[model samples]
Target chain A: KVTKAHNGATLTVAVGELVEIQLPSNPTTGFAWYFEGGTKESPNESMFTVENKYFPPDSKLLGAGGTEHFHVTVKAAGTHAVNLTYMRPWTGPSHDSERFTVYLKAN
Target chain B: QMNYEEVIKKYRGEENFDHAAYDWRLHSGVTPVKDQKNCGSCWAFSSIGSVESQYAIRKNKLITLSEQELVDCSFKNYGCNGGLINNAFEDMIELGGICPDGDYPYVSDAPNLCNIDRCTEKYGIKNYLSVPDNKLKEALRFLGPISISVAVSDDFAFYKEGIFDGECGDQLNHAVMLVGFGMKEIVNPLTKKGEKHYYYIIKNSWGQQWGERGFINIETDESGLMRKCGLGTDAFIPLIE
Candidate 1:
């Protein structure tokens, strides 16, 4: 099991092990995290299975943001990657907020 | 502890220096620039950003703290309307340390009661450091970012990029962060002639889409040494432990 907060992290796990990644998110400002697919070769489909994804605010405060929880189960993996980007869908290309990527290697 | 006149008398006609050369973002404890949206919460952003920088620089902790908490909870200040940084400091001290951005985020909503439940002691300030308005150079050189309310002109709304030498009033009405100061020789965009330009690096709450990467450089010489929009006047910092 591997859990990280920031982007560009890598780890090794069992052939079918699971991984969890939690990131900060707030939709109050009209911006959200988006899955931008993985690197070439070991695509997202061949890399892992997204078991769950949701947002839970830390408190009941207004405009408050919680963590973006992503649960994944390793699939037929060689060296798969998990990539995500933060952006507002309504704005132009120059509005891409941020990007995060994690690499996973399963034997 | 110097007065505004003393500061001006001390650093007048400041030549040959650039604070941006240090590139504070690469340093430890610097938080990311925040977006205040369309709300008139520039006061909150200016206060929070100033405190964030001081917290990181002195306490050696880099925390993305909340300014919206000031907008929503800090009493005496209008939420999306207008406010003063000094009053917000009083609110923070009376209540406690401010909550992190995760607990309370930025929203241009209406003002509400103080969110006492969300308040924490982890990020509470140690004290509020007061400085003369004209002593901005000394403050920035020592305390990091500063909280300042400046006179906003119509020309400021159209700032694209480059050293801003546009017209600005002396009456401060909007709050902002004074990040850095510099001097350079270049041709005036309008005059089409060679000249020297001095400027202060400022960060805005309007987000990255506005200004140059959420920041702007105002010509210091245009307003006579350090009077551009009263940037140095009504400036202070929150010392965090």
Candidate 2:
């Protein structure tokens, strides 16, 4: 299993491995990270399988923020791109203030 | 029926109250976790869940009831959008009883209609009591699980695990079940003294994937300084007939 949080990186894992991308989120503030389109923003469907999509607040503070975990099960032996945008759900992509992109190479 | 002082004295009348020492699952009649999905019908779940626990505690038989019945039938609430436990309880009593989940089940993704005209096997409540905010501990010790409302925060929706000693503001919008209360030992940095931190064990309506299997421990009154989400502010429990 390879867990990461960054702009762009090469995540190495086995074909039957799991890759997790965690990002900070606070829904109370109307700010969150959503995928570009489908589960895999790019051409990562042949390599990884989107398993779970949920947010788990790390901080115990009520009004505070927490981490959003994106779990995907690696399926094939190939590399693919994963992108995420952070902004208000009501806003458009052009208004995205932050982005996280990571590439996974499953062998 | 007892005041806070009286409840506290009566609680101290016996052994110390330790939530950690008791797990409802281990008991005979406690009900398992039930999901409310994204309907925002937490009030119905809390009310029905508390009644189910009370039934189990009294009859020693754990039976899952229908929260959908309250959601669709209870006229006082807005169904999926939002509802009140008291309103649901009133309807439950007036209708004679609430049907089991297996019977009526849940299907409404959005507020639709009520099926109060249907007659079926149901569970009836003999009476119910409102527990004062300060006397939550006594209420929980006596009644199995109590329905309480809390003002939830942004960070609350992401709760995964651990003893949540999170910072929460006042005014509760969501209602939940208070199963038990316990003390968490924490070191006071100023005096380096081991202070017994108190917390209320809450069972949420979110699926089991959310917190510690759909439950969160909220930090209790910090020496009367901060209130943990107005936990027991509006509390009620239904007694099985």
Candidate 3:
């Protein structure tokens, strides 16, 4: 079964299983989620495949926000983490930008 | 005009300066909770709320200002889309202040053409500035309400009641007003022990049915600083007469 993850969560999954991370996003406000970097002190990203998608608010309301989904598939299995930031791309990341990190371990 | 940091410092240094638990609503400094509806005009509401509170405190008369004017007029901001509080203030100043809500009511729709003539009895501000994160309490105590940005998590949309210590990030999106703050001793459900909880009273623009009568009490950290949802990161206050 696919594993669901959230900010600051840790999950154990079987190899080849998919881990999905969902976050609230509002692109209309010039803020969107972006991958920051992989963990350096811990196991890294050599054994993972990651993809991201954004879904707009499911309503006709003007300027409504949306959601961001990040899918990760463990390739070999060790331990890895996904670090993402929500910010305006033009302004770059800062302390004000929201950060989300999720840990994954595969057997 | 002096900078906000200097202003806050001056206020704190004044005699009889008190940072005690205070709420603008208790002193009739705040207007009723407003609803932004489906529009992304939260920036307008947040900025206007601060201006309204400042006017009420200075004049001892509460009058509803027009967020709809900002939404439809502020060219720098994206009406019904997204905008910034600073930009809204600038727009308000450039447009010669704002009108009462009766003059231009909120429709929760997209931006329309500007109507400067409709603004009779225009209430204007001298200036505005960003309040330092470390001095939010002093600023709120000396000033009236403050305009702040916050990262809205999915669960935050469904907040019912109680002090919000929920999961949130610093990816600021929504704009709201910080009106007051206080400390309370409550029993922790998990620990079953009494603990002192510090929280900031916030005024949201989601109508009266949202949180505590269209308000929210967001918990602060041990340092009495609100860090969650970027509450103090982009704090601002308008200087009104």
Candidate 4:
């Protein structure tokens, strides 16, 4: 488990439509994340999880205990981008963020 | 004493190795370049990586470089990070070895146009290493410089934090190349990254995050490792026009 953390950087996704999102740690904490995919930003809901503190078991990249990937799927099509800005707990106030956009082809 | 028999028995079950000295074609290493993912531009990254090294060798410079200009802004290409190596070679070479890392450089997405005035692409790039796909292994051993690939290590998409020592590194989604193998001196008992204990060395594009700045050297029978890379096939690059 990660002994410390810096803070939280919001992730941005544009998947043509709303579905799911997977945010992975920059140093890639071994596990990936699962959430909703959209053109703008995600909404605030009890289901949303930024920190590993409250995530489903399957979202674990290395089947739990290990951190590598955060798995998320977007049902609708567009450009889906998953990003992460990593900050170490040991280091103070060093927050960062990255974004990716997966575009869906026209049908 | 080391159990030589057990080691071979275990390896025989896994490796499909050829029995011969494998050759590693040492090409002139090029300038370090960045593979910007700002756009869906993987093609340019791979192409430029190979071409730039060749460009440097033709001119005879100890310099290591990458082809960012061709990657960032080539209309013939899909623009940004979108262009094929084959097409890039044909088009870029027709122009020249690309401008020095100065004239037109730097971009996460969208590179500058090929400098008609400063472009210095050497001729005969197409014949450089356009072999059949099956012969790719051969090309890798002989073509020299460095080669690019689709990188298919993660059968399960496992990109983890901290080094890929192969002990816990499962997911291999990121793509990279296999550089030269370090010589292993069995006479020595000590093993380290720069040491000769490890027989094979592989380079990656993930910077220095993974193994030795994105490079790793696996432990193998030094002789066998050499053969697998083409020490037996006698595949070496001959700059004959």
Candidate 5:
């Protein structure tokens, strides 16, 4: 089964199901989404395997925002929290940084 | 075919007017502001903006040119990653000119293919010349709008209105068009005194909603914010036909 998830969303999915999450992102402004509480080599490895991609705005104008897509495949049958932070990659996280988290329970 | 030095020498001492200000916009030589979306195609916008203005001034008609054509066909520069105004101009001339916006509309993403046959070429330029920083006013007044690059700061991204005297650095990263220049007696709120403020009107590609109806007034003084923004460091004007 394939499921769509949003910010602060909680959903239940069968084992081996794919959960697609999307969030607003604008790299031109030096702001992008980064994974939180994950190691570079094995991020969310115990719970799911994740893939990310960015889709730019479909307009001719400048300074428009785009979307960040995350495809998460459930690898374990347990509750997993997916955390992401939006900020300038060079400056690290800040006090005003935005965060997106999704709780998924796989059966 | 003329070089920058030769072009400057040819136009030098030709005009000695004392007008307080000049604007291509007032003469219908400037076109409306455009949006480059999320693409790093400011080079294309800046080049097209100057081309559109020069064409309008010489032909007495305003026509929208294609930035997408440059983004797709200009192999000299990176498609969406970024590009230079000179490289874009070279690509246009080599590709037999640029098409109308309706013919090759910008999709904010490069298709990585040069489809010049998708539309008819409407305009072409004979050559382009780079203007020195001190001679920008003369070039702008005589040649029409000029394509230039500037260093964009965070505050510059959210500029809403008024003359932008904000903080900026001298590391040119964005391209914009210089449309006009003028002076105004603005009252300083801190001192409660009127002071003469010379400003340059810049046409941006972030759409009409970004700044003052798609334009920004930047101070052109020696110590002004425009100097910090690297204005006029790499200015160019296309001699269009």
Candidate 6:
């Protein structure tokens, strides 16, 4: 199996609100945050930001398999997408994630 | 990051975070953009997209593109986001040539671009790329780009927080750029293996700040694009292209 996010999932965001999402765990601690259609490096898309959120840049050392909690704020009203791209950090580009959507309402 | 604006608009008041997956098998971003946000500048956005890629190719600039400016500043624009991309194409030939992305800048906010209605002739409808809306797979494979149309679905419109688990991958909406196509390419999270899948890559106008930075990949082919469009037996579209 090519190293990537579990089930190759993705995430989403909303506007003007703080929400917490639990990450589905995997063996590899190496994890990266990426927005769909966007990359993990500089996902500088508008409408929302992964503000005040904390996740280990080096997910490889996080653990074997466990659910990680992430807190993010919805900056704008829109469907912001995110993904957990996982791969061996130094080995090469090993990334994948399951997807989720966040519909932020304009306050 | 013109594409991000559009994507964000879809889920302004979102709650959930269920991500959906898509594999854009085959497509192109040839569809000329239209100024739909009351700008009637749809002409410039859509028209410039097709050529935008071409321009990016020729200019060797990193996908440097513009839309609103093409509609407002162009000599014979229909004006204020009211027309389709094809019509803008006609205006392009008539106006000597379309300017580069740097030449005409896009205003994050529509209705803001000045030079509205002050001058310039309303461009007439121009000849299109000569392709049916639905039946474009084969042509897309060969042709570099195309101008296509699609209806936006309810599911596709909503969802701001949760991840979309391909729950509504079939919902085809307002036309965007179908830049490239390919088989599925995913990583097997379990085995940590990369899987080869097929999908069409759709470049978006929501700005580079949006999904995958102004682009999304949706599954294409008889069972994918058309079906989600509600243009098939399983799907449902109020209207067809």
Model 1 C-alpha lDDT per residue in residues B24-140, reported as the tens digit of each score? 455653567788754556777888887788778777877777777788777777666567778878887876768888877665564555575674444777666667655566666
Per-model TM-score versus the true fold: 0.59, 0.63, 0.69, 0.47, 0.69, 0.42
Poorest 10 consecutive residues by lDDT, candidate 6 chain B: B232-241
Question: For model 6, how does the per-residue alpha-carbon lDDT over A60-92 read when each residue is reduced to its tens digit?
Answer: 111113334545565666554444443322223
- Residues A1-107 of candidate 1 have per-residue lDDT tens digits of 34345467677877777777777654433344556432112235565777544454534222344456677678885767776666544342245346778887787
Runs of candidate 2 exceeding 4 Å displacement: A1-107, B1-25, B108-112, B117-120, B167-170, B186-194, B221-226
True contacts kept of each: 0.01, 0.01, 0.11, 0.00, 0.03, 0.00
Per-residue lDDT over A4-107 for candidate 5, one digit per residue giving the tens place of the 0 to 100 score = 33667678887888777777655444456777532212265877888876666554233345667788888989988877777544345768667777888987
Candidate 5 — which pairs collide? Answer: A60-B35, A61-B35, A61-B36, A61-B37, A62-B35, A62-B36, A62-B37
Give the per-residue lDDT digits (tens) of candidate 4, residues A10-74: 33443333333343332222112223331122333222222232222332111112233333334
> What CAPRI grade goes to candidate 2?
incorrect
* Cα error, candidate 5, residue B226 (Å): 6.4
Error of 4 at B47 (Å): 2.9
Better of 2 and 6 by TM-score: 2
Better of 4 and 5 by lDDT: 5
- Which of 1 and 5 is ahead in TM-score? 5
lDDT of 4 by residue, B1-241 (tens): 2232343344344445432223233455544535333243444444555554555555565332335655543556655423444555555556544565554555544435444554354333443343332333333343443343332222112323322333322321222334444444444345433443434344434334433544444444534332222211211121212
Question: Which parts of model 5 have CA positions greater than 4 angstroms off?
Answer: A1-107, B8-13, B110-112, B189-193, B222-226
- The TM-score measured for candidate 4 stands at 0.47
**Positional deviation of B30 in candidate 5, in angstroms?**
0.7
Task: Sort candidate 4 into its docking category.
Answer: incorrect
**Clashing residue pair totals per candidate (backbone < 3 A):** 2, 6, 1, 45, 7, 125
